[PDB]
């Protein structure tokens, strides 16, 4: 049995309606009842029972919780939005032998869009001494998640190169930090003159280059 | 009901590796113990299970030939051994109980399985200068194994728009991950601002100081 | 019905199913009242070379 | 799409592993399958299709050759490789427009080291009658190819003047040879006395130097 | 499914060159055509493919301005034009027919086109007489052009221990490669050593004498 799980990406701001819906290739319904299980999972945490069968929530759930539906479809609803709510819900099946997990919801709270601020750091000169170039590309407190990173080496988009490294949500602040690392040897950073970050957001009306020459 | 595993072991390719789950709060002859994988940041993939009062072992098709699940009653503890480690099996391995007619109802914190070809390497840290409102700063630590790498500023003096971000593993099968603050422009005059890095599996303690 | 399929495409023989054998070689209808039997026949099918 | 073939230039032993990597900058995958192919040429003939896709293989290809990978990473594997594998394999895609090529790998087969039987030439009189004067150092049976030829006309190092030919491994010796030619005119071959030809090689505790006197 | 092509193109840099490509076996029609570039001894670059049925040609951005191919269904073969040759032009093309979702799927033997200012010229020999266990001795071929040449020793009595290197190709744009052997040195004095040189583009057939 194959779980897809319709989205897998929500933002919902506090108090608002969250709906995961979770389509099973065939029946999980035997013996009358529902095999339609619904996990949670705190980062830094395992997984806990939320729903076990469709509708009965497992032990220690908040009445927020709630699962429905029968057969091959399934949703669950959480309406009084908290803060602890923050977390990846999966649904898995129990009607036959191999247990099958769905793709996972990441669940997080909604803001308002808020435009990136992009920084440039130039690799350390100590660096430099070890054959080595880092340049970073860095964007703080910028919603939503969707950030298009683009390097520009003496106006050459570079592709292969480039490592992003993404920090959860914030606890208060709720605003991404992203951070993009571009590795060259010294000898090929030393190469070329100036080096150029392209950013491209929502928040933004245009994408936003920030650049520096090498020294 | 409370299950304890163990902590995050480390081996080469082609290996084995034996992990242990402690039941704890029930009888343990009443349960069967299913035991479920998790790439980190993945979905899950249930590995299978075993019953402890019959030695009746069910295991996932693409587990039967790696996976190996025993059970010992006497101490309350069931064991799982995986053979011929490959770095498709990096991961986070769960250990459950059987409750409330779901296959992994109870689960136990979480066993981190990392398989490498690298050894314990130390971490080499790189200022990354502000450049000539909120000006920016940070350090960078590259090449070092295996995570992680406890990093804070002035020794926990400056907490306030301090990003840490998640190591990444590069190509060459090591770790890296920037630490990075906000500041105020007037402040690179006269604040001294440190970088303290460490890294227990490497021993090292390591602060840089970071200016325009 | 009667064919020959890869070992791992063995999981796409079933109702609701994805991939390249269930979306374009032999799909399944959803109400489906009958059976699949499927064995393994790597010492007739499969040839030197 | 650039293509970096690891290792380029291979020597195992037979009947071991084999293995030849291809890292892609952007994804060759399209349409669910794979466009990594590769290719082997033995010198002398065409390049032949050994596995077109990941790992569905080309017509006539031993079950020894294996290919393995996705996204941008993959890998060519020969286990048990015999004697006829000695080629230059190449990895290529066929993802996007413009068909690119790896950079190629020689497969070579790997022996015990071998110190080199070192000789060295005067260039023949008839040709000094003709004006010129090739001086030849060679080096007969020598595994592997990594081999330092330095020229010392008088205790002094020759530069831009050396040419050196690599011949193609032996059958069955299978151990490489070489010769360096210094070319000179006659006016500055008769203005030195003693001609020498020193040879660094790793089967060697020391390098060995050959020297003629002129005459 | 067998190609033909020409063989050995001889051209002096500024001109253009034309090479054919005769399909075998198929319908010539339902597969595209491609070219593929190849210096000797080096990587491979993908010159540009044509559609025989319709005559849409796709080139590479560094070959685009001095490729052209066109194709003739009624012969069914291809034909790759080249302009303004430079050294850089000198190399092995291939034409291959497209299969197996790969762009050159069956190639070609191979067109080896030469871009070189230089004329036929014939070898001047020099016998690399041993030095005054096993001697060492052999020949030397010079200022030759175009390759190859015949390297052969007493008529093939000699087959041992024999070493013919490849040519290097001067900066005057001629080609020298020396052909080497270790001997018994019981044979230095009564046993006669002769090389045989044979350069069939300038039909140059010459015997040489190696005496210690």
């Known amino acids: 049995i194959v779980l897809t799980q319709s989205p897998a990406s929500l933002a919902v701001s506090l108090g608002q309606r969250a709906t995961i819906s979770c389509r099973a290739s065939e029946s999980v319904d035997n013996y009358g009842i529902s095999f339609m299980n619904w996990f949670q999972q705190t980062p830094g945490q395992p997984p806990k029972l939320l729903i076990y069968?469709?509708?009965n929530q497992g032990s220690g759930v908040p009445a927020r919780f709630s699962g429905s539906g029968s057969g091959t479809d399934f949703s669950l609803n959480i309406h009084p939005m908290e803060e602890d709510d923050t977390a990846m819900y999966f649904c898995?099946?129990?009607?036959?032998?191999?247990?099958?997990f769905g793709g996972g919801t990441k669940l997080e709270i909604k803001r308002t869009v808020a435009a990136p601020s992009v920084f440039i750091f130039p690799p350390s000169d100590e660096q430099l001494k070890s054959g080595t170039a880092s340049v970073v590309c860095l964007l703080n407190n910028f919603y939503p998640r969707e950030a298009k990173v683009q390097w520009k080496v003496d106006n050459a988009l570079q592709s292969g190169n480039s490592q992003e490294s993404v920090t959860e949500q914030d606890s208060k602040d709720s605003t991404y930090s992203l951070s993009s690392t571009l590795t060259l040897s010294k000898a090929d950073y030393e190469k070329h003159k100036v080096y150029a970050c392209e950013v491209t957001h929502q928040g933004l009306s245009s994408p936003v280059t920030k650049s520096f020459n090498r020294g | 009901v409370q299950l304890q595993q163990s902590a995050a072991e480390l081996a080469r390719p082609g290996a084995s590796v034996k992990m242990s789950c402690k039941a704890s709060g029930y009888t343990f002859t009443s349960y069967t113990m299913h035991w479920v994988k998790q790439r980190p940041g993945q979905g899950l993939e249930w590995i299978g299970y075993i019953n402890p009062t019959s030695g009746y072992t069910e295991y996932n098709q693409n587990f039967k030939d790696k996976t190996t699940l025993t059970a010992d009653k006497s101490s309350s503890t069931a064991y799982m051994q995986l053979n011929s480690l490959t770095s498709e099996d990096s991961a986070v391995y769960y250990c459950?109980?059987?409750?409330?007619?779901?296959?992994?109802?109870?689960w136990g914190q979480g066993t981190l399985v990392t398989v490498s070809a690298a050894s314990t390497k130390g971490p080499s840290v790189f200022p990354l200068a502000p450049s000539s409102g909120t000006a920016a700063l940070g350090c960078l630590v590259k090449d070092y194994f295996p995570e992680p790498v406890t990093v804070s500023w002035n020794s926990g003096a400056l907490t306030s728009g301090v990003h840490t971000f998640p190591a990444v593993l590069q190509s060459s099968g090591l770790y890296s991950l920037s630490s990075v603050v906000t500041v105020p422009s007037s402040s690179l005059g006269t604040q001294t601002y440190i970088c303290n890095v460490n890294h227990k599996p490497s021993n090292t303690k390591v602060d840089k100081k970071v200016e325009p | 019905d009667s064919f020959v399929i890869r070992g791992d495409e063995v999981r796409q023989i079933a109702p609701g199913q994805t991939g390249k054998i269930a979306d374009y070689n032999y799909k399944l209808p959803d109400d489906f009242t009958g059976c699949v039997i499927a064995w393994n026949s790597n010492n007739l099918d499969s040839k030197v070379g | 799409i650039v293509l970096t073939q690891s290792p380029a230039s291979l020597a195992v032993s037979l009947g071991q592993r084999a293995t030849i990597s291809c890292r892609a900058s952007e994804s060759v995958d399209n349409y669910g399958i794979s466009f990594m192919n590769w290719f082997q040429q033995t010198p002398g003939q065409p390049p032949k299709l050994?596995?077109?896709?990941?790992?569905?293989?080309?017509s006539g290809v031993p079950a020894r050759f294996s290919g393995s990978g996705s996204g941008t990473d993959f890998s060519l594997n020969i286990h048990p490789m015999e004697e006829d594998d000695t080629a230059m394999?190449?990895?290529?895609?066929?993802?996007?427009?413009?068909?690119?090529?790896?950079?190629g790998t020689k497969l070579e087969i790997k022996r015990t080291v071998a110190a080199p039987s070192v000789f060295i030439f005067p260039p023949s009189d008839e040709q000094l009658k003709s004006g010129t004067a090739s001086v030849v150092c060679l080096l007969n049976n020598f595994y592997p190819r990594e081999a330092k030829v330095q020229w010392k006309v008088d205790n002094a190092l020759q530069s831009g003047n050396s040419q050196e030919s690599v011949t193609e491994q032996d059958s069955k010796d299978s151990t490489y040879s070489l010769s360096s030619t210094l070319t000179l005119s006659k006016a500055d071959y008769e203005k030195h006395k003693v001609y020498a030809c020193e040879v660094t090689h790793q089967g060697l505790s020391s390098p060995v130097t050959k020297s003629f006197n002129r005459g | 499914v067998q190609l033909q092509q020409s063989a050995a193109e001889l051209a002096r840099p500024g001109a253009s060159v034309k090479m054919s490509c005769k399909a075998s076996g198929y319908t010539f029609t339902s597969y595209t055509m491609h070219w593929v570039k190849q210096r000797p001894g080096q990587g491979l670059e993908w010159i540009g493919y044509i559609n025989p049925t319709s005559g849409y040609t796709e080139y590479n951005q560094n070959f685009k301005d001095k490729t052209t191919l066109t194709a003739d269904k009624s012969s069914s073969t291809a034909y790759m034009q080249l302009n303004s040759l430079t050294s850089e032009d000198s190399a092995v093309?291939?034409?291959?027919?497209?299969?197996?979702?790969?762009?050159?799927?069956?190639?070609?033997?191979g067109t080896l086109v030469t871009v070189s200012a230089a004329s036929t010229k014939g070898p001047s020999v020099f016998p690399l007489a041993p030095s005054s266990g096993t001697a060492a001795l052999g020949c030397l071929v010079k200022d030759y052009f175009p390759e190859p040449v015949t390297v052969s020793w007493n008529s093939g009595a000699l087959t041992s221990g024999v070493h013919t290197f490849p040519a290097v190709l001067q900066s005057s744009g001629l080609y020298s490669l020396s052909s080497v052997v270790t001997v018994p040195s019981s044979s230095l004095g009564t046993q006669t050593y002769i090389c045989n040189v044979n350069h069939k583009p300038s039909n140059t057939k010459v015997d040489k004498k190696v005496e210690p």
């Open positions: 069968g469709s509708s």
């Open positions: 459950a109980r059987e409750g409330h007619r779901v296959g992994p109802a109870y």
């Open positions: 898995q099946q129990s009607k036959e032998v191999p247990y099958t």
